[PDB]
Structure 1
Amino acid sequence: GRKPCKLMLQVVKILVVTVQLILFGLSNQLAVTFREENTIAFRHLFLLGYSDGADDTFAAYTREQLYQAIFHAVDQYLALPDVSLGRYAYVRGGGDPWTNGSGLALCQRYYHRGHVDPANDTFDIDPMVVTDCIQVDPPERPPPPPSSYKNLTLKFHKLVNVTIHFRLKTINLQSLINNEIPDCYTFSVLITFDNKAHSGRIPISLETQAHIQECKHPSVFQHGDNSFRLLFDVVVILTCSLSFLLCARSLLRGFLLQNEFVGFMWRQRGRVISLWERLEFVNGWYILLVTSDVLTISGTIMKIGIEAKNLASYDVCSILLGTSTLLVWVGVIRYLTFFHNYNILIATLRVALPSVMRFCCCVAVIYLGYCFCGWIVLGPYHVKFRSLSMVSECLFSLINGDDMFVTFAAMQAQQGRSSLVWLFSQLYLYSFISLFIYMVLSLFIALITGAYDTIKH
């Protein structure tokens, strides 16, 4: 008899790919919460007079600040097991910015041969990153019976930046959720005294990389728990293969139908018709669904890599799982359109979206003109129109009424400075928002309003 829709096991991916995403995501989130709080700790340890909030605003301006910051950072490394809580340990380094038997490396980056003097110009600056590094590594015990890191000179005129390199091995003690011996961590701190500007302002930033592995243990019943999350991706590879195999057969019927439309008896209408509706001939939504497959499966293999080998980078695969989850979950709509009544409500979008897109091109075209205009006029005077990304962000957030009073307040502060710019910004912001709220959005509403009107008749 009539067997049911065995092809509709795409519902399995609605859970499986989402659970693959949430299993990964809940573990990966939990790692970051540990990762960042450590970087918060290192800022409280290694930065001289750091505060919870000032990151971009935290910086050196005098020379004694820069010295005392560096020495404060170093002396806080030297006494890490003494004063700092959490229990870290020194790397004992064998890498590039550390010598064969060194741990903390404060490293200048300054010009090779050069000179700077206004009103008496005689110099020959030859741009170069001549890095001088001072090594230091203290032992754990008190000093046994058997130097110049303090005797250190920056050359501030000549100084690009100062980088304090070190790594801290550590044991993530949120492992007791697994209930056995822990998984092992290694932070890679970089205290950067950045002076690329030479403007008398030196951002102090402490930033870390994380490297994770499993360190020696002979105990029992930890190794089995890892395999359950490892095995679940094979369900994803099993579903993905089935989905990838299933759309292509539907495409085969596409290619068959291509023939059969003319093919029962050829010359339906002479020759060579381009059949623009036929150019949307295959029901491609399932190919779009299967392509979201390819990003899921390409995601999982790359996630299995990052898990199963020393590969440590969560960017592309993290996008590919999310994009695929999103692009599967948007696909639940075209699963939902097998219902009759719901299909009318979604068909309104699929009859309007050409018109809405065809209008949106015009709005984007104006919006860009505004993004350019405000950028060069309000880039000098105001923070929130500095770069074209930030102008577009601030404007595109300003269309919905976010930080509008906060922008308009920045204008008044520059009313004493160039009233033409203030009055220009008043006229500019008003003309931007009034157009985009009462004429654009209104028309975006009008197109779909008219679509919903036209579709039922």
Structure 2
Amino acid sequence: EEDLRRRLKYFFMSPCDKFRAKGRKPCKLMLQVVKILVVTVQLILFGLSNQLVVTFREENTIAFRHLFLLGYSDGSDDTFAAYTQEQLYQAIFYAVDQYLILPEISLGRYAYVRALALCQRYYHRGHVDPANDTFDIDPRVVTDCIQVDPPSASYKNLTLKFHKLINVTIHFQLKTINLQSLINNEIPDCYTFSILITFDNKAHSGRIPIRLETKTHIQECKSFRLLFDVVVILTCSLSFLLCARSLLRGFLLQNEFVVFMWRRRGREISLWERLEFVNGWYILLVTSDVLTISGTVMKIGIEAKNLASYDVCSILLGTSTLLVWVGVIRYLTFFHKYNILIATLRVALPSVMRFCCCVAVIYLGYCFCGWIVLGPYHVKFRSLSMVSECLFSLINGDDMFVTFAAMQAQQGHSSLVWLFSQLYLYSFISLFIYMVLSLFIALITGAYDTIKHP
């Protein structure tokens, strides 16, 4: 019938044009704009909260490194290790003697938790004899703990076994009180640090690094956010249901052309002419709404102090706000002069992906080559992750002279890998800057002329 062709002309016409005919001023538009504003304000007010939470942990952890580590100035987290026997002993006894007299030496209300369990782990039968090259090593690990309670030889006379040694760990806990919350006129948030000091001897290289790790677990001692959080779940869920009804109309009006192309005998057209009917942005909207309400329920769990994980709530709210922001562009394309420029992206996106395959093959070629060859001689080419980050930083040009000076200084070791380094880096840089990037310029330019001139 000719009536069902008129069923399409409502759905195909823009929301801007449907004020003259039916006189329905859009509320769905206003729900979209309110959803933008309410999500972004919810993101900012959450993010400032974690800013004041994280800097308290970071500043206390630096304060523990200056209290419990022997000879520590900042800038030496990684390159800090014990190299002699007495230096490892004096590191251990400095840590515990700077634990027992804590409240005088500290600069806060660091209280104890009922405490310090020192322990070393050595192999069951570590028999090593490089004067005979015969051995008998039993890989069972023997834990050997010792207990320390705060208010000598019960703690002293501690004897390591340096011919069989894996780790020396120190566990204790400290409870403090956050003081900024009392300025903010609220219920305080007492923290409980879990300090772990580890003398790792994993590789057995004659070098024992030292590192300190903490972990907190907040619990309350003796609103505007919560009302705003039930708003952001309510409006965004209503947008989920409303545009689910729009997908309902798409999937039900799909059949009335398939019926209609059998009576008109439209030859049962393939994938594209049923692809060009449904939608182009409401998929982005519906995954924004699922992602938003999952993050906000997770946030209510966070700030009601049954929390245990900052990671999932942060990543879901961040990705949700990102997709809500790129949902603005579809309102820009209702104007003509913007619709040309956005159409340049869609006519250029297939050909730029067809070229992206031919780039990634050669790029992975130089990754696998440079990692094995310049691995033992450079320091930015240790693992394949660092190789891909280094080469892709050199595509645009970030750090060329430091890589060339690293191969210039030590001469690799032989002349062959230096002669290979010059040819490797010059061929790579001159390939991808001059030819490949200029093909990206030519593809976007030709796509612009194609969308322009007819």
Normalised to the residue count of structure 2, the TM-score between the two structures is 0.90
Cα distance in structure 2, aligned partners of 1:12 and 1:239: 8
When residues 180 and 320 of structure 1 are mapped into structure 2, their CA distance, relative to the original with a 3 A threshold, is closer
- Tell me the secondary structure at the aligned position of residue 289 of structure 1: helix
Q: Aligned partners of 1:235, 1:450: CA distance in 2, in Å? A: 47
SS of corresponding position for 1:3: coil
The answer for the alignment partner of 1:138 in structure 2 is: 150
- Aligned-residue offset at 1:413: 2.0
| C-alpha distance 415-273 of structure 1, shift in aligned 2 (>3 A) | same
Partners in 1 of 2:356 and 2:412 — Cα distance?
38
Correspondence for 1:89: 111
Contact 1:379 1:385 in 2 (8 A): yes
1:55-74 correspondence runs (5 A): 55-74=77-96
CA distance in 2, matches of 1:333, 1:193: 54
Structure 2 contact 376–382 (Cα < 8 Å) conserved: yes
Rounded to whole Å, the distance in 2 between the matches of 1:417 and 1:407 is 16
How far residue 73 of structure 1 moved from its aligned partner, in angstroms, is 1.1
Give the CA deviation at 1:23: 1.0
Contact (CA 8 Å) 1:46, 1:77: kept in 2 or not?
Answer: yes
CA contact (8 A) 2:195 2:214 kept: yes
Structure 1 residues 448 and 184, CA gap change in structure 2 (3 angstroms) = same
Cα deviation per residue 1:349-392 (whole Å; 9 max; x = unaligned)? 11101111111111111111111111111111111010011111
Report SS of the residue matched to 1:83: coil
**Paired residue for 2:385, among 386, 389, 401?**
389
1:5 Cα deviation from its structure 2 partner: 4.0
- Listed as ranges, the gaps of 5+ residues in structure 1 are 93-102, 140-146, 217-226
- Check the 8 A contact 1:398/1:404 in 2, yes or no: yes
Q: Distance in 1 between matches of 2:156 and 2:440?
A: 66
Verify the 8 A CA contact 1:108 1:131 in the aligned structure 2.
yes
CA distance in 1 between partners of 2:417 and 2:261 (Å): 72
Bigger mean CA deviation after superposition, 349-358 or 105-114: 105-114
Are the structure 2 counterparts of residues 272 and 118 from structure 1 closer, same or farther at C-alpha, using a change threshold of 3 Å? Answer: farther
Distance in 2, matches of 1:116 and 1:203, equals 23
Give the Cα separation in 1 of the matches to 2:108 and 2:80. 25
Partners in 2 of 1:6 and 1:79 — Cα distance? 65
- Please give the alpha-carbon distance, in whole angstroms, between the structure 2 residues aligned to 1:8 and 1:269: 42
CA change 1:248–1:63 in 2 (3 A) is: same
Change beyond 3 A, Cα 1:433–1:105: same
| Residues 131 and 250 of structure 1: CA distance in aligned 2, closer, same or farther (over 3 Å) | same
- Deviation by residue 1:264-305 (Cα, 9 ceiling, x = unmatched): 463444543213242243213211222022111111112211
Find the counterpart in structure 1 of residue 353 from structure 2. Answer: 357
The separation in 1 between residues aligned to 2:331 and 2:142, in whole angstroms, is 62
For the 8 Å contact 2:261–2:268, the answer to whether it is kept is: no
**Counterpart in the other structure of 2:120:** 108
Larger radius of gyration: 2
1:189 corresponds to: 195
CA distance in 1, matches of 2:243, 2:142: 58
User: Identity of aligned pairs, percent?
Assistant: 95
For 1:279 and 1:303, the matched residues in 2 are separated by: 37
Deviation readout 1:18-41 (Å, 9 max, x if unpaired): 111111110011111111111111
Contact 2:219 2:305 in 1 (8 A): no
CA–CA separation in structure 2 for the residues paired with 1:129 and 1:247: 60
TM-score by structure 1 length? 0.90
Give how far 1:109 is off: 2.3
Deviation at 1:7, TM superposition (A): 4.3
**Higher mean Cα deviation, 443-452 or 304-313?**
304-313
Q: Is the 8 A contact 1:247 1:287 kept in 2?
A: no
Assess if the C-alpha contact under 8 Å between 1:109 and 1:159 holds in 2: yes
CA offsets 1:9-56 (integer angstroms, 9 cap, x no match): 111122211111111110011111111111111111111111101111
CA separation in 2, counterparts of 1:229 and 1:416? 59
Aligned pair count? 430
The farther-off stretch of 406-415 and 271-280 is: 271-280
Label 1:107 to 1:266 Cα distance change in 2 as closer, same or farther (>3 A): same
Distance in 2, Cα, partners of 1:258 & 1:7? 25
Q: 1:340 to 1:42 in 2, by over 3 A?
A: same
Answer yes or no: is the 8 Å Cα contact 1:189–1:206 preserved in 2. Answer: yes
Query: 1:182–1:111: structure 2 CA closer, same or farther, 3 Å change rule?
Result: same
Asked if 2 retains the 8 angstrom alpha-carbon contact of 1:162 and 1:193, the reply is yes
Preserved contact between residue 106 and residue 134 of structure 1 (Cα < 8 Å): yes
The answer to whether the 8 Å contact 1:48/1:69 transfers is: yes
**Structure 1 residues 326, 270: closer, same or farther in 2, change over 3 A?**
closer
Distance 1:129 1:215 in 2: 41
- Could you report, residue by residue, the CA deviation over 1:113-156 in whole angstroms, capped at 9, with x for unpaired residues? 222222413322222332222211212xxxxxxx5322112212
Aligned to 1:205: 211
Which deviates more, 263-272 or 396-405? 263-272
- Distance in 2 between the 1:251 and 1:181 partners? 46
Q: CA RMSD in A?
A: 1.7
Q: Which structure has the higher relative contact order (CA within 8 Å, separation 6+)?
A: 1
Q: Is the 8 A contact 2:261 2:267 kept in 1?
A: no
SS of 1:203 mapped into structure 2: strand
Tell me how far apart the structure 2 counterparts of residues 241 and 292 of structure 1 sit (CA, whole Å).
10
Q: 1:137 to 1:335 in 2, by over 3 A?
A: farther
The alpha-carbon deviation at position 180 of structure 1 amounts to 4.2
1:409-443, Cα deviation, whole Å (9 max, x unpaired): 11012316122111211211111111111111111
